Design an enzyme around this catalytic site. Structure first.
Site, PDB file in Angstrom:
ATOM      1  N   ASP A  22       0.944  -1.120   0.000  1.00  0.00           N
ATOM      2  CA  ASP A  22       0.000   0.000   0.000  1.00  0.00           C
ATOM      3  C   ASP A  22       0.970   1.150   0.000  1.00  0.00           C
ATOM      4  O   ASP A  22       2.065   1.086   0.584  1.00  0.00           O
ATOM      5  CB  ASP A  22      -0.948   0.189   1.198  1.00  0.00           C
ATOM      6  CG  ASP A  22      -2.052   1.318   0.924  1.00  0.00           C
ATOM      7  OD1 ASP A  22      -1.742   2.530   0.886  1.00  0.00           O
ATOM      8  OD2 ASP A  22      -3.247   1.011   0.703  1.00  0.00           O
ATOM      9  N   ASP A  64      -3.001  -3.277  -1.851  1.00  0.00           N
ATOM     10  CA  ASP A  64      -4.085  -2.901  -0.968  1.00  0.00           C
ATOM     11  C   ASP A  64      -5.123  -2.093  -1.728  1.00  0.00           C
ATOM     12  O   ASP A  64      -6.328  -2.210  -1.489  1.00  0.00           O
ATOM     13  CB  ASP A  64      -3.503  -2.119   0.201  1.00  0.00           C
ATOM     14  CG  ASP A  64      -4.550  -1.672   1.223  1.00  0.00           C
ATOM     15  OD1 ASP A  64      -5.240  -0.640   0.970  1.00  0.00           O
ATOM     16  OD2 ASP A  64      -4.632  -2.320   2.299  1.00  0.00           O
TER      17      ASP A  64
HETATM   18 CA   LIG Z   1      -4.249   3.538  -0.219  1.00  0.00          CA
END
Ligand SMILES: [Ca+2]
Length: 682
Positions: free
Chosen positions: A478, A547
């Protein structure tokens, strides 16, 4: 056999005559979606975008040129004439056209107004000094099945909003405006507040300009007022949002999340209630659109089946047992994989000889498991009430000491506050609630706690025996950035590299400076150089879990760095928000799936525990040699690497907590560059 928000949608128009419009200039990706909106506004007939040509539904008399003006200030001209429609090429086109029908036939507006008439009383919640409303939002997206049919994905969610405007609010009291998610009235948009300033600061032509540049009607009417009404203009504020979009505080209503919690938890609804409501919304669309050539199946699309995954876990001695709720038995008898035989722990109690008795039993359970806790320092705090968030602030700030773990006994924002702070300092934390010892059976709590303290200190209780698929590493990423005007300022990347047996090889958390493409590239090259540093030879299979949605830039960086280091890449996007739900009474839904076109699967990652609390994830194979079903099984197996047997975790260990950790480090003052092998977030 498990129902979903998906219904076969079809378009077979009577008057198949469409007016085409192509620009005399160029193609501009971000702006194409904005023009298409404006082509529909000036025309009044539903529109879709077929590459460069803007197809409109019907005949516009005397039509020559279209001079649409965008948000930028750039004017756009487009001309041409007729062609007859023969089905769609994209799901995108179907959606674009379908949506404009819901608008021009005002059927979503008839619904919203008919749901207020019967439910206004139920929709409203009251408190002492404030009044809130649970506004209904009906979001429709057109997807494509495995077989090839277009599905109307239709849902109903409740937007929590105050009666008071952002202007009425900014007027009365000065509460912290930044990071507040707001939404304009007749607009399908939510953004976070960046900058607030007075409308006095700008003169007459600004308002007239921003009015001429306004995309929707409520915003034309909001700029019209500030220009024409000086009482307003003086006391008024203009708010600048994330992406850039400027809107007057007058049309902005705040969007809320998080007794109010109780009366607003009836919004979760029973699965029968959303399902029958969605079923009620469909019926109205079909009245409104049958005459226009639209069909929507009254019947939900059923899931394909249960995908078995390798759930068998084992300890250091090698005891095997399938994981369905992870036996208390297994966790009683299991020998962990010791990373640190001796530990330094700090303790905290928030009070008003149970905690002590328990702490002692814990210490003993783990000693007899090879890990010895050595108490560095007991910090006892005395509450009355909230005055404690302050009396806890003081001992938390000093707790970086050198602690391996921190055990806190509290007498919900309480759990939340404490964990976030110890997450920032990166010190693993176990927050035991006093309510838990009072209410649950002490052996289960002891076990629940045991399993978790082991994971947080690298002394993992178990690891998977087999993961389906001969993959050499599972990397989860992420990347969260801070947006200021246009180009990226601050950014944090959080990578988690895993084993074929599911264990944590290494994590990498870095804050990155301000540079264009060098950001994405460095972030991902760093990920690659770390894999190299960890002895991954040329030709090893690498599964990446993202993510969020993999931005085109990232997909690129990977493919090129995959080419460069000679790795076999598999790229997966993991979408947790706004997916098609699963409705059934099965309660053992983990593994359930519906398969879409471009190797995307709506997947049930955990069993239904609490009512209406079921969010299926959407896994997309962006790039990959392996089938989705195989990649899905590995995702399902990795949920178990979160070591929460008594509680459910929706996300695979590769992305679980990844979005919460990056957004936290961004709020920092200092940059990070850290690597570890501990799952400190658990
Ligand atoms: Ca994000």
């Amino acid at each position: 056999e498990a129902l979903l928000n998906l219904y076969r949608i079809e378009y077979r128009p009577k008057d198949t005559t469409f007016t085409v419009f192509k620009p005399t200039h160029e193609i501009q990706k971000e702006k194409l979606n904005k023009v298409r909106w404006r082509v529909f506004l000036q025309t009044g007939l539903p529109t879709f975008r077929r590459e460069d040509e803007f197809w409109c539904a019907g005949k516009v008399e005397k039509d020559t040129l279209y001079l649409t003006l965008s948000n930028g200030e750039i004017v756009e001209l487009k001309r041409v004439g007729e062609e007859e429609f023969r089905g769609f090429q994209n799901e995108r086109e179907c959606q674009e056209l379908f949506r404009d029908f819901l608008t021009k036939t005002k059927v979503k507006d008839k619904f919203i107004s008919d749901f207020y008439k019967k439910f206004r009383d139920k929709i409203t919640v009251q408190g002492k000094n404030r009044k809130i409303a649970l506004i209904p939002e009906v979001n429709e997206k057109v997807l494509k099945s495995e077989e090839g049919y277009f599905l109307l994905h239709l849902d109903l969610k409740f937007r929590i909003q105050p009666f008071e405007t952002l202007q009425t609010l900014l007027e009365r009291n000065d509460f912290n405006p930044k990071r507040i998610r707001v939404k304009p009235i007749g607009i399908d948009f939510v953004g976070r507040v960046q900058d607030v300033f007075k409308a006095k600061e700008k003169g007459e032509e600004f308002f007239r300009l921003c009015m001429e540049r306004s995309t929707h009607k409520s915003s034309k009417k909001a700029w019209e007022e500030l220009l024409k009404n000086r009482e307003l203009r003086e006391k008024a504020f203009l708010v600048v949002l994330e992406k850039g979009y400027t809107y007057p505080a007058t049309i902005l209503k705040p969007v809320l999340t998080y007794e109010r919690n109780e009366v607003a938890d009836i919004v979760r609804m029973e699965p029968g209630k959303r399902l029958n409501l969605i079923r009620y919304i469909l019926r109205r669309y079909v009245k409104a659109l049958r005459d226009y050539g639209w069909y929507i199946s009254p019947e939900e699309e059923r899931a394909k089946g249960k995908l078995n995954f390798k759930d068998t876990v084992l300890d250091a001695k090698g005891k095997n047992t399938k994981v369905i709720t992870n036996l208390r038995k297994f966790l009683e008898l299991c020998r962990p994989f010791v990373k640190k035989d001796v530990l330094s722990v700090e303790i905290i109690s928030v009070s008003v000889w149970r905690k002590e008795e328990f702490l002692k039993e814990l210490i003993n359970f783990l000693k007899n498991k090879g890990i010895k806790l050595k108490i560095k320092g007991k910090s006892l705090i005395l509450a009355q009430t909230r005055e404690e968030a302050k009396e806890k602030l003081i001992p938390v700030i000093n707790k970086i000491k050198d602690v391996d773990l921190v055990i806190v006994f509290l007498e919900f924002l309480l759990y939340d506050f404490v964990k976030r702070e110890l997450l920032k300092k990166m010190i693993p934390s176990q927050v035991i609630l006093n309510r838990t010892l009072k209410n649950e059976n002490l052996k289960f709590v002891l076990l629940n706690v045991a399993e978790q303290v082991l994971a947080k200190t690298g002394n993992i209780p178990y690891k998977l025996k087999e993961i389906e698929g001969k993959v050499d590493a599972f990397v989860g990423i992420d990347i969260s950035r801070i947006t200021r005007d246009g180009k990226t300022v601050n950014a944090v990347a959080f990578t988690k590299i895993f084993n074929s047996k599911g264990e944590l090889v290494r994590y990498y958390l870095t804050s990155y400076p301000a540079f264009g493409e060098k950001l994405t590239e460095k972030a991902i090259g760093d990920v690659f150089s770390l894999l190299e540093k960890l002895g991954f030879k040329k030709g090893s299979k690498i599964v990446v879990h993202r993510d969020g949605r993999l931005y085109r830039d990232e997909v690129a960086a990977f493919k090129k760095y995959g080419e460069l280091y000679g790795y076999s890449l598999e790229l997966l996007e993991i979408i947790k928000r706004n997916n098609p739900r699963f409705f059934s009474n099965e309660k053992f839904i983990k593994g359930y799936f519906y398969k879409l076109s471009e190797d995307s699967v709506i997947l049930a990652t955990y069993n239904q525990v609490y009512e209406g609390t079921h969010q299926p994830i959407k896994v997309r194979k962006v790039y990959g040699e392996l089938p989705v079903e195989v990649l899905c099984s590995q995702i399902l197996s990795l949920t178990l690497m979160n070591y929460s047997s008594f509680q459910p975790i929706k996300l695979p260990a590769t992305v679980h907590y990844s979005d919460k950790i990056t957004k936290l480090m961004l709020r920092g003052i200092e940059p990070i560059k850290k690597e570890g092998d501990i799952m400190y977030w658990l």
